[PDB]
Amino acid sequence: KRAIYPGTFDPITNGHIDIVTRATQMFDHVILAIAASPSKKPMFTLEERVALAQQATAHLGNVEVVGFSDLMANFARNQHATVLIRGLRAVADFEYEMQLAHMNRHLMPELESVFLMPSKEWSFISSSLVKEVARHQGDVTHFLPENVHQALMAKLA
Amino acid sequence: KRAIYPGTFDPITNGHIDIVTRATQMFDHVILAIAASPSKKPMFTLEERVALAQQATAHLGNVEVVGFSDLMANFARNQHATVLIRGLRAVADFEYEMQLAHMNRHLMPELESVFLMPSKEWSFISSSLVKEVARHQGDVTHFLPENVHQALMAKLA
Amino acid sequence: KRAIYPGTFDPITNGHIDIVTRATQMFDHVILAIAASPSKKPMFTLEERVALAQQATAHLGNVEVVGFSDLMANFARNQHATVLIRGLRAVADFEYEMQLAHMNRHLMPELESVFLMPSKEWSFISSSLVKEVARHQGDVTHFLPENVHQALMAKLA
Amino acid sequence: KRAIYPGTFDPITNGHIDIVTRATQMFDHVILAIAASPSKKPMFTLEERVALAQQATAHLGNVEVVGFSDLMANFARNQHATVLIRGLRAVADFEYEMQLAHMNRHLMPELESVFLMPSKEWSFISSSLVKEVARHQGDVTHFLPENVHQALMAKLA
Amino acid sequence: KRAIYPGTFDPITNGHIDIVTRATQMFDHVILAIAASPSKKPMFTLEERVALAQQATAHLGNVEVVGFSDLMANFARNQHATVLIRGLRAVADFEYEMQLAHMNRHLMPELESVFLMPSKEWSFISSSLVKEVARHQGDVTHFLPENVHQALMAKLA
Amino acid sequence: KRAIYPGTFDPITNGHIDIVTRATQMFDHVILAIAASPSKKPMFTLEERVALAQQATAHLGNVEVVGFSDLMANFARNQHATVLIRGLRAVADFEYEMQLAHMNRHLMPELESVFLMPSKEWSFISSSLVKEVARHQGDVTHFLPENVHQALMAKLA
Numbered sequence: 001k002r003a004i005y006p007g008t009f010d011p012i013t014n015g016h017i018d019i020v021t022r023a024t025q026m027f028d029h030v031i032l033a034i035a036a037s038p039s040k041k042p043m044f045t046l047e048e049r050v051a052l053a054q055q056a057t058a059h060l061g062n063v064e065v066v067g068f069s070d071l072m073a074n075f076a077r078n079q080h081a082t083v084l085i086r087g088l089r090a091v092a093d094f095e096y097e098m099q100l101a102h103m104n105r106h107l108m109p110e111l112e113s114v115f116l117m118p119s120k121e122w123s124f125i126s127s128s129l130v131k132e133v134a135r136h137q138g139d140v141t142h143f144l145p146e147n148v149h150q151a152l153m154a155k156l157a
Numbered sequence: 158k159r160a161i162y163p164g165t166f167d168p169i170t171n172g173h174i175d176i177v178t179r180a181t182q183m184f185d186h187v188i189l190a191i192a193a194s195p196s197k198k199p200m201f202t203l204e205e206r207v208a209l210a211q212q213a214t215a216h217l218g219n220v221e222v223v224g225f226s227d228l229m230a231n232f233a234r235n236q237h238a239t240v241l242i243r244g245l246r247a248v249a250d251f252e253y254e255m256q257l258a259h260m261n262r263h264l265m266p267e268l269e270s271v272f273l274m275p276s277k278e279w280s281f282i283s284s285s286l287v288k289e290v291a292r293h294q295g296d297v298t299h300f301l302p303e304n305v306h307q308a309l310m311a312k313l314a
Numbered sequence: 315k316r317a318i319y320p321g322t323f324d325p326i327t328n329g330h331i332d333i334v335t336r337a338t339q340m341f342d343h344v345i346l347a348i349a350a351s352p353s354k355k356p357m358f359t360l361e362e363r364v365a366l367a368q369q370a371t372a373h374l375g376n377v378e379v380v381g382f383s384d385l386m387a388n389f390a391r392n393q394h395a396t397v398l399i400r401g402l403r404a405v406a407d408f409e410y411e412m413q414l415a416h417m418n419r420h421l422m423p424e425l426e427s428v429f430l431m432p433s434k435e436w437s438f439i440s441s442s443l444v445k446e447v448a449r450h451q452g453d454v455t456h457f458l459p460e461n462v463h464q465a466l467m468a469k470l471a
Numbered sequence: 472k473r474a475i476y477p478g479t480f481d482p483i484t485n486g487h488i489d490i491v492t493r494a495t496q497m498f499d500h501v502i503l504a505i506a507a508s509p510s511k512k513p514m515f516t517l518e519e520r521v522a523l524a525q526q527a528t529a530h531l532g533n534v535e536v537v538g539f540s541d542l543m544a545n546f547a548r549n550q551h552a553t554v555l556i557r558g559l560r561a562v563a564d565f566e567y568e569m570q571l572a573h574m575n576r577h578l579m580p581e582l583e584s585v586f587l588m589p590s591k592e593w594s595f596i597s598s599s600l601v602k603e604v605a606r607h608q609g610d611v612t613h614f615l616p617e618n619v620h621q622a623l624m625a626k627l628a
Numbered sequence: 629k630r631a632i633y634p635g636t637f638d639p640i641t642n643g644h645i646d647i648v649t650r651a652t653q654m655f656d657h658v659i660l661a662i663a664a665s666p667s668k669k670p671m672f673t674l675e676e677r678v679a680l681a682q683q684a685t686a687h688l689g690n691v692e693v694v695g696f697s698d699l700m701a702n703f704a705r706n707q708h709a710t711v712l713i714r715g716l717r718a719v720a721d722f723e724y725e726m727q728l729a730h731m732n733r734h735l736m737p738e739l740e741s742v743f744l745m746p747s748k749e750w751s752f753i754s755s756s757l758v759k760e761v762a763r764h765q766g767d768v769t770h771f772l773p774e775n776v777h778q779a780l781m782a783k784l785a
Numbered sequence: 786k787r788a789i790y791p792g793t794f795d796p797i798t799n800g801h802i803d804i805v806t807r808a809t810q811m812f813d814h815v816i817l818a819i820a821a822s823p824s825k826k827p828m829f830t831l832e833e834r835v836a837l838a839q840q841a842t843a844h845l846g847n848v849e850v851v852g853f854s855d856l857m858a859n860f861a862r863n864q865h866a867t868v869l870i871r872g873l874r875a876v877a878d879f880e881y882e883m884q885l886a887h888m889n890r891h892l893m894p895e896l897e898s899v900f901l902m903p904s905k906e907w908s909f910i911s912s913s914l915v916k917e918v919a920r921h922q923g924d925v926t927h928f929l930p931e932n933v934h935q936a937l938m939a940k941l942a
């Protein structure tokens with residue numbers, strides 16, 4: 001049973017770690033797939049994002065961090081994933097998640113979307129807000145693995 | 158890997174069948190658990206709902222239909238389940254499912270909630286709607302397993 | 315071109331009047347159809363609701379008030395309607411109206427659902443809210459047709 | 472500056488306590504007003520709910536617990552309140568609270584509605600959910616004031 | 629009775645065809661109005677979009693495809709439209725639709741917003757997602773008229 | 786009791802005036818804080834926005850208009866504000882408001898988010914839409930203080 005948990009992870013947060021951890025507890029192998037080139041210039045480069053994610057999940061044995069540049073469904077297919085992990089925060093745009101899951105189902109029906117729920121602690125935080133706050137002199141240490149926190153300070157310095 | 162898919166299933170619909178089927182694709186064993194739910198004054202007795210669900214899922218070897226009047230979390234623990242399946246049709250489902258999921262996580266943290274999305278075909282039906290239509294002799298054959306439609310026909314005048 | 319605007323109208327409010335009025339602007343004939351709705355244990359009997367609606371819409375020559383206990387879709391077909399009018403106040407309405415609209419489309423595909431939006435003035439009222447306020451002697455004259463307010467006054471102590 | 476925080480509080484929960492506490496931080500006096508709400512067939516009598524709320528808020532010197540069967544707007548005016556406190560957990564709350572707030576503004580324009588947000592810890596609980604869990608002997612000690620949990624234990628078998 | 633169904637239609641999809649078809653069944657004349665210059669550079673030029681839309685609706689007699697560059701309300705007014713067609717997918721941002729309808733009502737009250745619902749098949753697809761997927765090597769043939777599919781391949785080649 | 790009502794106010798609208806007016810009625814001092822440099826180039830400059838806002842609130846004695854460039858929470862802290870005013874329109878993105886309030890609570894817990902509701906008249910209008918319409922030859926006089934209307938015409942001329 002191979003699951004894929006895709007995203008930009010720019011950068012990976014405690015919320016993402018929460019979700020991938022839950023995924024590793026119900027599925028044999030989990031591929032944390034990092035989108036290479038997003039429509040908008042990411043704060044960290046793919047190599048940086050992969051390194052940070054690898055370090056943050058080093059303790060999770062059945063987790064494999066990989067980068068990809070094609071349509072997520074095309075990558076999932078070549079990787080033989082049959083489960084698609086989506087994290088649903090309390091502040092998630094549910095309508096958008098439905099659009100996405102149905103489009104992904106159209107593209108690869110053999111890939112089943114599965115939604116996991118983070119702990120209440122990370123249920124109201126989005127990576128976008130974390131970055132905006134950090135870029136504007138706010139403390140976001142609480143939302144990030146220590147390794148990511150250190151990399152973020154260097155990036156904004 | 159044992160998953161539990163609880164609900165009132167009054168009566169079980171093609172939407173429920175869609176969800177439990179997707180559940181069997183990713184988990185070894187799935188327990189379709191029917192709660193007595195006296196507070197909801199169900200149209201069918203627990204025994205009737207269990208019988209209906211059993212016949213509607215007889216073709217699914219990985220599914221086990223059972224009824225329960227206990228706290229769902231205790232029943233799940235006692236059934237050795239570690240995955241809690243829920244279906245999401247839209248926003249309403251999502252909000253209510255989050256409250257329920259967080260309460261269950263508080264009661265049994267090792268029971269991980271997982272939300273699945275039905276096909277577009279069943280994204281707008283519910284037991285309540287089917288019953289209302291049936292109370293007015295409307296044709297609901299399209300939304301229910303053969304045995305369930307028959308039972309509903311009989312149940313009403 | 316005959317349209318049907320079904321509901322429980324228990325009792326009819328200025329919000330309902332707003333919607334039916336907009337309906338008459340674009341369709342030749344509009345049937346305001348009041349469902350018996352015993353499952354909702356209406357405050358007013360069907361006969362009372364029809365009488366109230368008739369007087370509240372007497373000034374609208376293109377409106378015809380009628381009561382029905384049949385499946386709404388069959389009543390619409392039997393009334394030769396091809397347009398199904400619904401009012402949308404907000405999200406909640408939208409989600410529920412989609413389930414209802416798709417069920418009706420399954421029952422009668424040639425009955426096309428159309429959603430209209432009320433004025434800002436009536437975007438937050440409902441029969442339920444008006445009744446709750448009235449049960450406590452609150453002034454609801456502003457939200458109801460004169461004849462309806464009188465009837466509500468009488469109905470309560 | 473007197474604020475009123477009305478509700479059915481059947482029974483009062485840590486979520487309610489969170490909101491009323493935040494209310495006391497910005498307003499001089501806060502009246503926790505418990506409505507009889509017979510239409511909701513409360514589990515506890517008004518007298519029981521008031522007693523429970525009184526003990527659960529005894530440590531809050533700025534809070535005054537009272538019961539009422541009048542129109543909330545008239546009670547607020549008669550209590551000399553000019554601020555109406557409401558708690559928002561999510562979307563559902565927001566939509567319903569807007570209808571209620573606009574009706575109250577129509578009944579008493581000088582009573583200004585104010586919405587507060589609970590901690591993440593209590594963002595997913597409700598009296599209804601706690602009662603359902605308790606009806607099945609589930610552990611709800613974490614979500615209720617000590618005195619309330621005891622009373623709930625007793626109330627049920 | 630003249631209705632206007634405005635949008636960017638970049639490019640026109642099966643969902644748009646679904647909606648305009650329903651509009652032609654309840655209104656005498658329907659103007660499929662294509663916005664000339666959108667805030668963001670569209671994939672197809674206005675001439676291309678008009679040609680594609682014309683071909684896709686060639687079978688609908690009471691449909692007129694026209695381009696416009698001014699505020700939609702200004703164009704609707706000069707065109708003497710009294711009905712404004714809006715398609716409401718299950719994944720629509722309802723709040724935004726309300727903002728839009730009320731702004732359009734402020735600008736031209738004689739233009740009544742009417743919301744139609746697409747079939748379940750096209751209820752979860754947005755043009756934006758269709759384009760993104762196509763641009764990223766995904767199959768979107770299913771969502772587009774054959775003429776649009778062919779034009780899209782040439783555009784991305 | 787010092788409250789802060791932050792935003793871009795580009796430009797200040799009748800809706801903003803509605804909210805700040807309500808805030809001045811329940812709090813001793815209200816700081817209308819105008820964000821200096823927004824992620825996107827604003828229509829009016831900070832000086833212009835401050836001047837317009839000052840003129841529009843000149844009649845409100847306990848209102849102080851000030852500009853700020855740092856993270857809102859950092860400014861609120863240095864200004865010793867303990868109340869954060871947020872206006873909640875009927876078309877507000879509630880999920881986003883929850884994200885924001887929780888992030889602001891993380892950054893400065895001593896600052897309590899308080900949500901106020903505008904009148905029905907301004908409940909469906911966003912500054913973004915007002916600007917878009919104005920820039921595209923639509924009449925938005927109704928939504929703006931006369932001083933802002935005059936400044937807007939000059940800006941677009």
Ligand SMILES: CC(C)(COP(=O)(O)OP(=O)(O)OC[C@H]1O[C@@H](n2cnc3c(N)ncnc32)[C@H](O)[C@@H]1O)[C@@H](O)C(=O)NCCC(=O)NCCS
Binds near residue numbers: 164173192261603607
């Ligand atoms: C009975 C329970 C599970 C609530 O059940 P519910 O009413 O949601 O069951 P229902 O038959 O309506 O639905 C079951 C599931 O199928 C989903 N579903 C229904 N129709 C569809 C459809 N057409 N497509 C996809 N999913 C669907 C629902 O969203 C839900 O996730 C709950 O009250 C419970 O756990 N009761 C036992 C007592 C207890 O322990 N209570 C405390 C719980 S915290």
Ligand SMILES: CC(C)(COP(=O)(O)OP(=O)(O)OC[C@H]1O[C@@H](n2cnc3c(N)ncnc32)[C@H](O)[C@@H]1O)[C@@H](O)C(=O)NCCC(=O)NCCS
Binds near residue numbers: 320441
């Ligand atoms: C009675 C029906 C139509 C449900 O009615 P409903 O409770 O929504 O009626 P109600 O009076 O509350 O509202 C009627 C319409 O007016 C709208 N409305 C109410 N207030 C407002 C307002 N203030 N502004 C705008 N619209 C409003 C509602 O959203 C609805 O669209 C439905 O149950 C039905 O069709 N019953 C007959 C049996 C049947 O065939 N059932 C199966 C249906 S699939």
Ligand SMILES: CC(C)(COP(=O)(O)OP(=O)(O)OC[C@H]1O[C@@H](n2cnc3c(N)ncnc32)[C@H](O)[C@@H]1O)[C@@H](O)C(=O)NCCC(=O)NCCS
Binds near residue numbers: 557595
């Ligand atoms: C009783 C009233 C206030 C409705 O009360 P309600 O059921 O919402 O009370 P309830 O105890 O459920 O909640 C009270 C408040 O606390 C909030 N709340 C509940 N749990 C939480 C939580 N965990 N976190 C944050 N807020 C919460 C609610 O959203 C609400 O704002 C209303 O019906 C009323 O005013 N009744 C009197 C008669 C009247 O005048 N009616 C007309 C009113 S317009």
